Amino acid sequence: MILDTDYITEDGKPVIRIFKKENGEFKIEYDRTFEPYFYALLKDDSAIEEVKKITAERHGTVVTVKRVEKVQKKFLGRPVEVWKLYFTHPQDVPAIRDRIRAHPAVVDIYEYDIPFAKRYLIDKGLIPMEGDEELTMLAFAIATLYHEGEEFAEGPILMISYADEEGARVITWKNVDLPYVDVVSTEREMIKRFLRVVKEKDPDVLITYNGDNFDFAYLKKRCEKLGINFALGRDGSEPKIQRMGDRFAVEVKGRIHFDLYPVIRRTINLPTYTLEAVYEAVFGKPKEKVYAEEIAQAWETGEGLERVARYSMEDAKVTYELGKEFLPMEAQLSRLVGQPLWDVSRSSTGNLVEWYLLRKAYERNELAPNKPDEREYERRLRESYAGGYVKEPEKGLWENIVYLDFRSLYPSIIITHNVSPDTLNREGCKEYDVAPQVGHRFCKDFPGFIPSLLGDLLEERQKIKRKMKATVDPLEKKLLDYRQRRIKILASSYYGYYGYARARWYCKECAESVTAWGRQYIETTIREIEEKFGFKVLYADTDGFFATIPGADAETVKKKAKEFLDYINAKLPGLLELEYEGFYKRGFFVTKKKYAVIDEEDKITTGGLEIVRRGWSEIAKETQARVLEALLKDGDVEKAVRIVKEVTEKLSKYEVPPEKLVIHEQITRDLRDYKATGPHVAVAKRLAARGVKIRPGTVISYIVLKGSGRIGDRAISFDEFDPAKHKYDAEYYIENQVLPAVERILRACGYRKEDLRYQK
DNA sequence: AAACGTACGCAGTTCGCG
DNA sequence: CGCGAACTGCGA
């Protein structure tokens, strides 16, 4: 099993390191024969001798062309003749590529910015994470001493916990009487003890939750202050911080640092992504959270540290269990993309596509297009195109609703209509498909590059969807459901890649052709179900719609829906397939992107509602949730109205706990870059002026008090709320929080109650 | 050096124009 | 003051 690859430099020459696990043993395979290269398209063959003499410099090293070789390749399927330029070191290429491209006889250069380690795995046909080798894993977490206004890692680390199959333990330098706690005397001794534990256990995988941003950076800073060599790497190196765009990540040489946060963030849909919320969503069990202030109080007074040590232990325990569950999913994606799990688990879906395209292009001797330069990138950013079809929803509380959607609308269109940059407006093409409205022609004579790849990806998803249905175990079934959804989004991300400005295989004509065909197909299914089966489509968005037969009972709606599915699937061509998603006994559709339905098990699913979003207080979400249940489950409009009257009366009489009035909103930039100052920005600016560290990602938790001025003038951070001096704004939480969250819902059901609120 | 990206859509807060 | 634009943030 190949775990990872990188390169080092020995005496000026690059040495590829292949990190492997074979027969239960970690091994490093070295390759000193791999030469970096890129391609040059020349105006005339005779200029190659002048191109060979181009030189450059980098860090005191004179860069020259080592060897050139003429090769026959394809570019978007058409034969091309380019020169392969070899170099000694991969760092030579960035230093010299601009001067080579600037030569008057050089038309363009290609494949000049592919990282040396990824170039090696592609050109050698090597796939990570293959085989039956069992990987050893170890999760860890830290607890720190925090005080408001201090620099990052100004206070010491208090606890370091870890967990594997042998259990979970905590290392700390204060006496805590728990059997899983190991006590040392100083923070330095605890760090060095943790370093020892990792050395003796020698795990292949280090699991964290947000270790890319907090744990490793905190450990790093503390190790510099204490003079500790944090030699976590299998080659004796320290963890290395890396940067991708605006995100940071930490690698440990010879191992796989598996940070679960970017994995869970795009695998599960949750309102918040705390470790406690993630563990509860996956395993169905709650996890207690102990906050930084209680940790500091327990450590500094010495009272109540067992609770802190239990929280620290459970942090490591649930991180190991989560990592164990999600490793197989990310291992498969690593095999599918063809890049190490460290990169695949963190990289954007654009690179998940492009890294695979680069590998398949190499297998087919297809020259890769370049990432755009500054002018082309800006031009792609400005241009846009039409997207999915969204229908204005029908008002009212409807009954006996079916939701029908396409299995994989955009990948199906790409394959069926052969939508690819190498098939667009192809000369001398015999048979082609013309996209509606946008009019682009896609050749059908030969399968396009990208269409020829999506079919296998879709089948991999159907394989997981089959194993999911055949698995009775609820946890294993849920994990497979997470897995098949990741593959579905990855495949559909091929359409978005077509419109992504940084894409090598960018194709705006391809992107708007896919959406145009998508709009045509959903409008076709909508027209057919209404005309031929007497259905009424209530709401539709991009690849699915809600429909019913007005006045019919549940059995008739169900029976006629399957009949229509047989009818429409016979008509729909290629890979397009409409599916029976589910039946719902009641539902309403507030606006576009806003709806709520309930199945025959009384389970309420919603879309785009306030119960999920940030910026809404608990009293508003709770009241909305109770109104949803009263309308959907009980069908009782008078009960829903009664609930609103009771909640607004409780607010007017100050009987609602102020904890239910906290509003959480995230700061997304430096406070200087805000052009308008709203409630959460005004609070953040007031906090920062007092020494509180405000950074992008900081969540502001405020409450609106009775006072004067704008809402921002009345809002204060909830951590400073004192019920002895502060009285909250009851009129605000009624008129701006509770009422907007229920009034649109009740109106969408056809009930515009004048005096919903208590008194006024 | 490497780059978290597709269109469509709602809605709260703020504040000058007419 | 009604209205709407600008800003802001998030949600197939």
Ligand SMILES: *OCCCN1/C(=C/C=C/C=C/C2=[N+](CCCO)c3ccccc3C2(C)C)C(C)(C)c2ccccc21
């Ligand atoms: O390499 C040839 C081009 C040189 N060049 C520039 C290079 C910038 C490199 C960025 C390095 C970097 N890393 C390491 C990359 C892997 O993450 C890193 C890791 C972690 C945190 C931060 C960082 C950074 C910040 C920056 C610059 C210097 C930009 C430049 C300017 C003009 C011409 C050539 C180059």
Ligand SMILES: [Mg+2]
């Ligand atoms: Mg790497």
Ligand SMILES: [Mg+2]
């Ligand atoms: Mg664009």
Ligand SMILES: [Mg+2]
């Ligand atoms: Mg069909």
Ligand SMILES: [Mg+2]
């Ligand atoms: Mg006027």
